[PDB]
Structures are given as C-alpha cells and as structure tokens.
Amino acid sequence: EDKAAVERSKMIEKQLQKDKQVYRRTLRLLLLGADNSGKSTIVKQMRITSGIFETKFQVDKVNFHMFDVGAQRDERRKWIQCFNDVTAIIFVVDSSDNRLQEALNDFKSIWNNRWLRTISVILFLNKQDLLAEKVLAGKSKIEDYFPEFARYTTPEDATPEPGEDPRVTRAKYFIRKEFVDISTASGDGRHICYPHFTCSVDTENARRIFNDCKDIILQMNLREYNLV
Amino acid sequence: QVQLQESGGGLVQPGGSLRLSCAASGFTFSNYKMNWVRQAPGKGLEWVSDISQSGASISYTGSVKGRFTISRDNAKNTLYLQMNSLKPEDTAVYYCARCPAPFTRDCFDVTSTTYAYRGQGTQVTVSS
Amino acid sequence: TASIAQARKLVEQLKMEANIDRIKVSKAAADLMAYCEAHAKEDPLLTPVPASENPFR
Amino acid sequence: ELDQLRQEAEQLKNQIRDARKACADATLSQITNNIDPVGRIQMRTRRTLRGHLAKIYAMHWGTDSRLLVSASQDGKLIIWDSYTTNKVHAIPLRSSWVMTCAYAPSGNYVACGGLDNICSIYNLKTREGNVRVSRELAGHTGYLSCCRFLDDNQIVTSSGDTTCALWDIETGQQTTTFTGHTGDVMSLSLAPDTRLFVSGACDASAKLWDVREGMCRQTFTGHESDINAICFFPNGNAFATGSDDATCRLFDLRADQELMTYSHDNIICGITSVSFSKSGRLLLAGYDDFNCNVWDALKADRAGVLAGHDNRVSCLGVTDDGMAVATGSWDSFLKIWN
Amino acid sequence: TNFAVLMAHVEVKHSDAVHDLLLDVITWVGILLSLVCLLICIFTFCFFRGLQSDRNTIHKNLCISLFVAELLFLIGINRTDQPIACAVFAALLHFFFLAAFTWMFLEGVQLYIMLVEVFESEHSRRKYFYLVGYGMPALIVAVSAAVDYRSYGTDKVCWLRLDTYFIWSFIGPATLIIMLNVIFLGIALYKMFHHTWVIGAIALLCLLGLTWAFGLMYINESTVIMAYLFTIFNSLQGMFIFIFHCVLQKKVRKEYGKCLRT
Known part of the structure; x- marks a missing residue:
C-alpha cells in the first residue's frame, strides 16, 4: 500500500508549495514601548487573558502584520528571542521630561543583545506638543537632569521648521543626539537606527514604516552582490 | 545559591561622606557586569552607575556626575561606592545588581x- | 501583610524540607553504575547492531 | 516581626547546609577510576527531512518509534513517517508563535501551545478522516513552555507565571495547581511511572512534585544562572540539567544534592536541549555554537561531536527502542542519526 | 578561422604576417582551458541544494549553452568538404550562441528587479524565464531558415555567409543585447554612490557579456590589436565565471568545505 502513501505525500507537498509562496512575501514587525507612551493610539491610528495581539494593514498592495504583547510579566529576556527574524522593531518614546533615563537604558540594552544585533530599529519620539508647551512655559528646567545642556548649541547646519522658537529646537535635537550617540557608539555598520518626530494626531506613519523597510531590503540585497 | x-x-548630615561596600558569594566574580540601584520613598526602582568586567568602562547617571565613585575589587570579591557632598534627595535604600x-x-x-540575583539593601539617611 | 505571609510560607517550607531521611552518595553512585552495566547489551547507539536488522539501513 | 522570620530562615538554611555537608564522603570521580572509556563515538546522518519554512522549536517521538511530530514558527505542525520520509499529516494553527508540542501515547491526539496562553488538543483518527480541533484549554496568565500527556484524559502544563497545572480534558477545567517557584518555569519532565515530575524554573533552582496531592517534596540549587532543559534518567532516580552559564549537572533525589558537573575551559555558550540514552551512558546536549555534544555521563569527559547544522540547535530526541536520534535546529532542517 | 570569425562583418580581412599562427594557438589554448571550468560550474549549480534560486537557474543555463556552443565550434568548424554535412552545423551553432546571449540578457533583467522593484512579487516567473530563454532563439532560427536556408555554409568555413547580409542575423540581436546590459550596470553603480567594491564590479563584467563588443570594430590592418583583445578575453569567459562565482564566494566555498569534510 505504498502507492496511496506516496499520493498523500504529493498532495501535501502541493499544499506546502502554495503556503510557502504566500508566506514569502509578508513582512513582520514588532512594537515596543512603555506604558506612559502612546503606542495604543498608533495601533488605532493605522488603517488598511490573550497573550499576544495582532493587527494587519496593507500599503501599496504589500501586506504588513504587526504584533503587540499583552498579558505577560515584566521580565523580557526569554520571549524576546522569538523575534530574531522579523523585519523591524518599532520603538516608541515619551519625550516629555523624569523617566527618559529608563528609555535610554532600555534602548541601549535592546541595541547590544546578541540575538538582535542584525535587526533594525525605527525610533518614534512621540509626545511633541506636550514637550513644546512644557519647555516654552519654563516651570521645569532640563538642566537639572542633564548637565550637558549647559553648553550645547544648535549645529550651524540645522534645518528648523518655520514658525518655531529656537529653544524647543535645541531641546528636541539634544534629546535626539543622546539616542544617536548611544546608537553609533558601537560603530559596526550592520544595522541602522531611524529617528522621527510624531504627535498624538497624525496620519503619516504607514508611509514611514514602508520607506524604512524598503531601505532595509535594499541594503540586504546589496550585500548579496558583495557590492556595498 | x-x-x-x-x-x-x-x-549623615548634608554635605557629608560615606562609603558603601558590598560582598558577594556563590559565583565567579570577574565574568559579570555590575550595577547600582536605589529606591526613595514613594518611588520605583532607579539606576545610578555601572562597571564592566575589567573596570575599564564606567557609566553614571547625570545626577551623580562629579560626586560618586565606583570600584571593583576582584581579589576580595567586593563592589565599592564612594559618596560625597550629599543632598537630602539621596535618602534611600540601596542595592547592588548582577x-x-x-x-x-x-x-x-x-x-x-x-529579579532573582539582587540584594537586600542598606539605608542612607541625610538630615540636620 | 504580604511580606509576613511570604516569610511564613518560606519558613514552613524550609521546616518541612529539613526532616527528610537521606542516604550516602556512594550508594547512589553504586546504583547508577549497576544500572549502566545492566542494560549495556541493548544500547545500539553505544553498541552498533548489524546492517540487516537495522530499520534505517 | 520580619527580623525574627528572617533569622529563623537563616538558621534553617544553616542546619540544611550542615546536614548536607555531613554526607559527602566519596566523590563520583574517585569511585569511578576503573571504568573503561567509551572511546570515540562517530555518528553519521541517515536521513534529512525537509519541508519547513522557518525555525523549528519542538519535536516529540511516537510510541512505536516510527512516527514523529514537528512544530515551526510559521504556523505548521507536521506528522512524518521516518522510515520512508513520507508526509502523513500537515496541520495549520491559529497562531504562528508556537513553543511546544506533544504526541499522545495512544497515538490518537496531539497538543500544542505558545504565546497565546492556551493549550490546543487535536484529534487524529475520526470517521471522516479529517483532523479537527477537539479542545482549547485556557486559564494560564503567562506563556506556556512545555506540555506532556499522562493518558487520553489528563494533561500537565507549565507556564511563565511561575506555575504548573494539571488539567482534565473532557470537562475542560483545571484540577490542580502547583505554585512555589520565583521566576519563569522553563521545563518539566515526567517519571516513567507517572506519579512524580520535576521542573526547572529560571532562578537556579529545581523542584520535584507529587501529582495526586499538590505539594512540593524537595528542591535543589547550585547553578549560577537560568535553567533551560531537564529530563529524567531511565530508572526515575536522577535527572540532568543544563543552564545558560555553560555548564551541565546531575542531580539525585535521595542523597538530595549534586553529583557530577560537565564543563570545559573553552565552552562559553549555554545549553539548549538535553536528553539521555537508553542505558543512561550517553548524555546528549545541544549548544548555541551550532553543534551537539555527546558526553560520557559517568566520566565527565567528552566522547563525541555532531557538527552538521548551520544555526542554533533547539530540539533533540531519542527513540523508545534506542535506534535513532533526531535533532532540529534554527535552519529549518531536521536530521536523523544512527 | 581563429575565433573572431563569429564577430566579423568585413570580409576583406587578409593578412601579410605570421599573425594567424599566434591567433590560432591562443584560441585553442583558451577554449580548452574552458570546458573544464564550465563542467565544474554546472555540477556545482545542479547538485547543491542550498543554492537553489532564480539567479542560480540563469547561471546554470548560461553555462550549459556556452558548453554546447564551444564544443560544436571545436569539433566542426573546418569541414567545408561535405556539401550537406555541415550545412547543419551552422544552424546548431547559431541557435546555441543565441541562447547564451539571451541568458546574458536575463542576468541584467534580474539585476533590475532586486534594486529598483525591491519587494517580492505575487507569482513565480520561472516558466517565463524558460520560455524567453529558449523561445527567441528557436523563433529566430526558424524564421531565418524560412527566409533563406541555402546560406548555411561558406567556402573557407561553414558558418553564416557574408556576400549576402545573412551574418547580421547573429550580429544584429547580440549587439542590441549589450546596448541594454550596460544600462542596467550603470543603475547598480548609481545606487552605490547614492545609498552607501572593485572585485564585485569586475565580477559583474563577465556574466554581462560586455567584452564581446571589441570584435565589432575590426576592419583593416593597424587595428589588429582589437582582435587580440577579443580572442584573449572572450575565449576565457569560463575561467572568469569559475573564478568569480565558484572560488571567491563565501557560500559556494563553504558548501564545498561541507561536502568535502564528510
């Protein structure tokens, strides 16, 4: 009765070929942030005891699946190894000073882990309007938590947006400079960080994720040709 | 264990000085990276400074820049924090971390x- | 008083774990060696079998 | 008072340490200076099963030593016939993040679990010939790590909320809950008689549990970091543990302490999977440096290497009659050795 | 009748020196140096599971076509003494050289859809590859034979004729293909200077048959240096393909080590 067995194997192989063709052209992203951030808003901002939540969207006829972590504990050193083959990690930060040091430390620890040294990170510095109002009002002083803001000056090649006070520009680019210094401290050249500024009510995030994924795959293709 | x-x-009065010393047992001491943590009333868990395997890399939080010094003693299995010129907002319980x-x-x-491999702590109180 | 309950449970468990009969280590070593020697003729990965009776060849 | 409780805990711990140090008279290495070394052990790949699309995390053998199940991070569970490399079943899952699998001792059911905090039980032989989902078990508050069957109607699970549980299938309700660890629970193993089982749980500690009652019998310490894999010795009177500190160890349940350490000065990577052989003479272990090691369990000296993989080795298993050894790794292939 | 008759539209080339002996020796030494590397390439691209992909497909077919064409060139070019026995060799040579050039073109088209259209596509395109690789050569040979079938064989050698312009039924398309490959090449290098070396750019000079244009500008004497470059570089195409895509590649060399260390 070997003939029936071989027939069953061939049918299963046909099914697996269809499944592989579907699977090979879907991108997978992982979302990370803190409780006081606004990643839920971003999840509700994107349109086409559960342990994990999944959302799906489609941009320019390409399908993205995104994943968020629900009912889990706060120790992350074991289920973070399940995401070593994803396309990108999306990190959301509350840039309204204080818990910025915790965000810096978490980003630094993500950056240096062995199973995540080839994975790129897309950085969102959320909470912009709150930062603007806080710094403009002047009740709280940034110089208390970070002494190095007592000498920083805006680089001469800056390109500020119109209708904006220089003080808020100094603040925001200082905060970005800290993260980029931690990023380029290793200086290896195998993975890259992308910083952006976002607010609570915006409608241009899918395009940013799209473009950075395109750049990621372009680099990966150029490395195949030994042509970089 | x-x-x-x-x-x-x-x-200790404001502007004072002390030295925090911590001892370890149950593992080789050199292969690891070590950290300092403190907790103040009505707060969570904070972070202060870190030192690597050899003692050639150091890192501090901004609030204790120019104040406190960290030391690794391999032969005697000890971690050291020299602490000077204090403020009342240093009143806390203090732990090491592996x-x-x-x-x-x-x-x-x-x-x-x-977290498993963390100490019990010591109390630092500053007033006058 | 969560800490009090946790300490009480820890002390109760330690007390229940300090009154169990124990034997010597060399006895355990002898038992393991005897077991290893007993079933040595039926271990193909350590004692290879002929090719005729091998299901995989 | 807290101080009195802490002092009593310290005194009990010191009494335990004294009574434990009052039992080490002979070492395993001194009583075993007249054992013939097994010599070099060379193993050759006989089969290579292909068909998965991403990394594999688990596999279980059948009771007849012919059929096996495999689980991958692409939402699929395949049932293979190893003799002929045929495919007997392919099953798609509702979730892609799978971490465990189990195969029923009677050959009628399979189970799976992962990051959805849910254990799914699938029926194999139905009147229509189709595989359908028979049960879903819910109630855990953290990701599942391992699951094993006792019979057609009971199951045992271990989760990342520091707990283990015994489940009744027909009613669909929890029957018993085992608590007492401190960190995530990583692996559990079942005894040959199925009345006691052991768990390793990511705080350098291991415990033994009785099923019909629900209490902890004894605990063991000694590792420096997390614990990753665990399994029983054939006679049910020992077990072996691997850790993320690049060391393996052997524990016993009657002398109630440590016996033998397997380590080296070059090995600086942890241990992923562990399983014994039929006689208890070979200890097989997977490492994060792409290859598997075969250890003489009584001499603590290496005896063989298997070096055919191109990524991390995750799962490893031995047959019920002793014939073949099956390994699966993060490169989407699976190999049979004999 | 050395090697440059393939690319030779000016029929009045007549020499007055000892050049012919050197050119013939270079051709014979070059081709036999190939046909040994191409076999290794075909075996490597066929018998190895870890390299299966579209690029490997195109490489394997290019090697097969080159092997057949060069073998037929060596066996049956100097057989002008049987009027109906190499008027069939010309057709085979035509068809297989055209196949080689079509696969060279598919190399550049493949280079397009991995840097410009970065993402994957819905459906596999293997069948269209096999249908454009072996379809256009067959169609061109059939149409050419329909228009004229008696021009398959000359007096000096039996390749395409020259009194009538039948030769442009091979020079025509081939040149066109080159005129597109260079385009694609530039695009690749453009990304190098806009999004982020010598070894890779030289390695792409062999799959893309860019050196084949040297033997088009070879008309009178005091131009003989061009035929020399053609004969030296093109007859050694197999050697360069082998060196660049079978020795300096980490993947292929690791696979060799794995299959040999067992």
Whole structure:
C-alpha cells in the first residue's frame, strides 16, 4: 500500500508549495514601548487573558502584520528571542521630561543583545506638543537632569521648521543626539537606527514604516552582490 | 545559591561622606557586569552607575556626575561606592545588581517582580 | 501583610524540607553504575547492531 | 516581626547546609577510576527531512518509534513517517508563535501551545478522516513552555507565571495547581511511572512534585544562572540539567544534592536541549555554537561531536527502542542519526 | 578561422604576417582551458541544494549553452568538404550562441528587479524565464531558415555567409543585447554612490557579456590589436565565471568545505 502513501505525500507537498509562496512575501514587525507612551493610539491610528495581539494593514498592495504583547510579566529576556527574524522593531518614546533615563537604558540594552544585533530599529519620539508647551512655559528646567545642556548649541547646519522658537529646537535635537550617540557608539555598520518626530494626531506613519523597510531590503540585497 | 550583602550607610548630615561596600558569594566574580540601584520613598526602582568586567568602562547617571565613585575589587570579591557632598534627595535604600548572564554586555535587571540575583539593601539617611 | 505571609510560607517550607531521611552518595553512585552495566547489551547507539536488522539501513 | 522570620530562615538554611555537608564522603570521580572509556563515538546522518519554512522549536517521538511530530514558527505542525520520509499529516494553527508540542501515547491526539496562553488538543483518527480541533484549554496568565500527556484524559502544563497545572480534558477545567517557584518555569519532565515530575524554573533552582496531592517534596540549587532543559534518567532516580552559564549537572533525589558537573575551559555558550540514552551512558546536549555534544555521563569527559547544522540547535530526541536520534535546529532542517 | 570569425562583418580581412599562427594557438589554448571550468560550474549549480534560486537557474543555463556552443565550434568548424554535412552545423551553432546571449540578457533583467522593484512579487516567473530563454532563439532560427536556408555554409568555413547580409542575423540581436546590459550596470553603480567594491564590479563584467563588443570594430590592418583583445578575453569567459562565482564566494566555498569534510 505504498502507492496511496506516496499520493498523500504529493498532495501535501502541493499544499506546502502554495503556503510557502504566500508566506514569502509578508513582512513582520514588532512594537515596543512603555506604558506612559502612546503606542495604543498608533495601533488605532493605522488603517488598511490573550497573550499576544495582532493587527494587519496593507500599503501599496504589500501586506504588513504587526504584533503587540499583552498579558505577560515584566521580565523580557526569554520571549524576546522569538523575534530574531522579523523585519523591524518599532520603538516608541515619551519625550516629555523624569523617566527618559529608563528609555535610554532600555534602548541601549535592546541595541547590544546578541540575538538582535542584525535587526533594525525605527525610533518614534512621540509626545511633541506636550514637550513644546512644557519647555516654552519654563516651570521645569532640563538642566537639572542633564548637565550637558549647559553648553550645547544648535549645529550651524540645522534645518528648523518655520514658525518655531529656537529653544524647543535645541531641546528636541539634544534629546535626539543622546539616542544617536548611544546608537553609533558601537560603530559596526550592520544595522541602522531611524529617528522621527510624531504627535498624538497624525496620519503619516504607514508611509514611514514602508520607506524604512524598503531601505532595509535594499541594503540586504546589496550585500548579496558583495557590492556595498 | 547566589548571595549579595551590603554594608555601610546610616545617618549623615548634608554635605557629608560615606562609603558603601558590598560582598558577594556563590559565583565567579570577574565574568559579570555590575550595577547600582536605589529606591526613595514613594518611588520605583532607579539606576545610578555601572562597571564592566575589567573596570575599564564606567557609566553614571547625570545626577551623580562629579560626586560618586565606583570600584571593583576582584581579589576580595567586593563592589565599592564612594559618596560625597550629599543632598537630602539621596535618602534611600540601596542595592547592588548582577547581570543575568556571563560574557555579555546587556542588562534586564530593574524588574519589580522579584529579579532573582539582587540584594537586600542598606539605608542612607541625610538630615540636620 | 504580604511580606509576613511570604516569610511564613518560606519558613514552613524550609521546616518541612529539613526532616527528610537521606542516604550516602556512594550508594547512589553504586546504583547508577549497576544500572549502566545492566542494560549495556541493548544500547545500539553505544553498541552498533548489524546492517540487516537495522530499520534505517 | 520580619527580623525574627528572617533569622529563623537563616538558621534553617544553616542546619540544611550542615546536614548536607555531613554526607559527602566519596566523590563520583574517585569511585569511578576503573571504568573503561567509551572511546570515540562517530555518528553519521541517515536521513534529512525537509519541508519547513522557518525555525523549528519542538519535536516529540511516537510510541512505536516510527512516527514523529514537528512544530515551526510559521504556523505548521507536521506528522512524518521516518522510515520512508513520507508526509502523513500537515496541520495549520491559529497562531504562528508556537513553543511546544506533544504526541499522545495512544497515538490518537496531539497538543500544542505558545504565546497565546492556551493549550490546543487535536484529534487524529475520526470517521471522516479529517483532523479537527477537539479542545482549547485556557486559564494560564503567562506563556506556556512545555506540555506532556499522562493518558487520553489528563494533561500537565507549565507556564511563565511561575506555575504548573494539571488539567482534565473532557470537562475542560483545571484540577490542580502547583505554585512555589520565583521566576519563569522553563521545563518539566515526567517519571516513567507517572506519579512524580520535576521542573526547572529560571532562578537556579529545581523542584520535584507529587501529582495526586499538590505539594512540593524537595528542591535543589547550585547553578549560577537560568535553567533551560531537564529530563529524567531511565530508572526515575536522577535527572540532568543544563543552564545558560555553560555548564551541565546531575542531580539525585535521595542523597538530595549534586553529583557530577560537565564543563570545559573553552565552552562559553549555554545549553539548549538535553536528553539521555537508553542505558543512561550517553548524555546528549545541544549548544548555541551550532553543534551537539555527546558526553560520557559517568566520566565527565567528552566522547563525541555532531557538527552538521548551520544555526542554533533547539530540539533533540531519542527513540523508545534506542535506534535513532533526531535533532532540529534554527535552519529549518531536521536530521536523523544512527 | 581563429575565433573572431563569429564577430566579423568585413570580409576583406587578409593578412601579410605570421599573425594567424599566434591567433590560432591562443584560441585553442583558451577554449580548452574552458570546458573544464564550465563542467565544474554546472555540477556545482545542479547538485547543491542550498543554492537553489532564480539567479542560480540563469547561471546554470548560461553555462550549459556556452558548453554546447564551444564544443560544436571545436569539433566542426573546418569541414567545408561535405556539401550537406555541415550545412547543419551552422544552424546548431547559431541557435546555441543565441541562447547564451539571451541568458546574458536575463542576468541584467534580474539585476533590475532586486534594486529598483525591491519587494517580492505575487507569482513565480520561472516558466517565463524558460520560455524567453529558449523561445527567441528557436523563433529566430526558424524564421531565418524560412527566409533563406541555402546560406548555411561558406567556402573557407561553414558558418553564416557574408556576400549576402545573412551574418547580421547573429550580429544584429547580440549587439542590441549589450546596448541594454550596460544600462542596467550603470543603475547598480548609481545606487552605490547614492545609498552607501572593485572585485564585485569586475565580477559583474563577465556574466554581462560586455567584452564581446571589441570584435565589432575590426576592419583593416593597424587595428589588429582589437582582435587580440577579443580572442584573449572572450575565449576565457569560463575561467572568469569559475573564478568569480565558484572560488571567491563565501557560500559556494563553504558548501564545498561541507561536502568535502564528510
């Protein structure tokens, strides 16, 4: 009765070929942030005891699946190894000073882990309007938590947006400079960080994720040709 | 059986000085990365400074820049924090922290939900 | 008083774990060696079998 | 008072340490200076099963030593016939993040679990010939790590909320809950008689549990970091543990302490999977440096290497009659050795 | 009748020196140096599981076509003494050289859809590859034979004729293909200077048959240096393909080590 067995194997192989063709052209992203951030808003901002939540969207006829972590504990050193083959990690930060040091430390620890040294990170510095109002009002002083803001000056090649006070520009680019210094401290050249500024009510995030994924795959293709 | 025990601390006037010394038992001391943590009334768990395997890499939080010094004593299995010129906002309980794995440069050790290899702590009180 | 309950449970468990009969280590070593020697003729990965009776060849 | 409780805990711990140090008279290495070394052990790949699309995390053998199940991070569970490399079943899952699998001792059911905090039980032989989902078990508050069957109507699970549980299938309700660890629970193993089982749980500690009652019998310490894999010795009177500190150890349940350490000065990577052989003479272990090691369990000296993989080795298993050894790794292939 | 008759539209080339002996020796030494590397390439691209992909497909077919064409060139070019026995060799040579050039073109088209259209596509395109690789050569040979079938064989050698312009039924398309490959090449290098070396750019000079244009500008004497470059570089195409895509590639060399260390 070997003939029936071989027939069953061939049918299963046909099914697996269809499944592989579907699977090979879907991108997978992982979302990370803190409780006081606004990643839920971003999840509700994107349109086409559960342990994990999944959302799906489609941009320019390409399908993205995104994943968020629900009912889990706060120790992350074991289920973070399940995401070593994803396309990108999306990190959301509350840039309204204080818990910025915790965000810096978490980003630094993500950056240096062995199973995540080839994975790129897309950085969102959320909470912009709150930062603007806080710094403009002047009740709280940034110089208390970070002494190095007592000498920083805006680089001469800056390109500020119109209708904006220089003080808020100094603040925001200082905060970005800290993260980029931690990023380029290793200086290896195998993975890259992308910083952006976002607010609570915006409608241009899918395009940013799209473009950075395109750049990621372009680099990966150029490395195949030994042509970089 | 990982064990860490702290010593030093107590009461000290503003602008004072003390030395916090911590001893370890139950593992090789050199392969690891070590950290400092403190907790103030009505707060969570904080972070201060870190030192690597050899003592050639140091890192501080901004609030204790120019104040406190960290030292690794390999032969005597000890970690040291020299602390000087204080403010009343240093009143806290103080723990050491060991990284979970050897031969690495990453940490996941601030968790409230009972991180395993963490000390019991000592009390530092500043008043006048 | 969560800490009090946790300490009480820890002390109760330690007390229940300090009154269990134990034997010597060399006895355990002898038992393991005897077991290893007993079933040595039926271990193909350590004692290879002929090719005729091998299901995989 | 807290101080009195802590002092009592310290005194009990010191009494335990004294009574434990009052039992080490002979070492395993001194009583075993007249054992013939097994010599070099060379193993050759006989089969290579292909068909998965991403990394594999688990596999279980059948009771007849012919059929096996495999689980991958692409949402699929395949049932293979190893003799002929045929495919007997392919099953798609509702979730892609799978971490465990189990195969029923009677050959009628399979189970799976992962990051959805849910255990799914699938029926194999139905009147229509189709595989359908028979049960879903829910109630855990953290990701599942391992699961094993006792019979057609009971199951045992271990989760990342520091707990283990015994489940009744027909009613669909929890029957018993085992608590007492401190960190995530990583692996559990079942005894040959299925009345006691052991668990390793990511705080350098291991415990033994009784099923019909629900209490902890004894605990063991000694590792420096997390614990990753665990399994029983054939006679049910020992077990072996691997850790993320690059060391393996052997524990016993009657002398109630440590016996033998397997380590080296070059090995600086942890241990992923562990399983014994039929006689208890070979200890097989997977490492994060792409290859598997075969250890003489009584001499603590290496005896063989298997070096055919191109990524991390995750799962490893031995047959019920002793014939073949099956390994699966993060490169989407699976190999049979004999 | 050395090697440059393939690319030779000016029929009045007549020499007055000892050049012919050197050119013939270079051709014979070059081709036999190939046909040994191409076999290794075909075996490597066929018998190895870890390299299966579209690029490997195109490489394997290019090697097969080159092997057949060069073998037929060596066996049956100097057989002008049987009027109906190499008027069939010309057709085979035509068809297989055209196949080689079509696969060279598919190399550049493949280079397009990995840097410009970065993402994957819905459906596999293997069948269209096999249908454009072996379809256009067959169609061109059939149409050419329909228009004229008696021009398959000359007096000096039996390749395409020259009194009538039948030769442009091979020079025509081939040149066109080159005129597109260079385009694609530039695009690749453009990304190098806009999004982020010598070894890779030289390695792409062999799959893309860019050196084949040297033997088009070879008309009178005091131009003989061009035929020399053609004969030296093109007859050694197999050697360059082998060196660049079978020795300096980490993947292929690791696979060799794995299959040999067992």
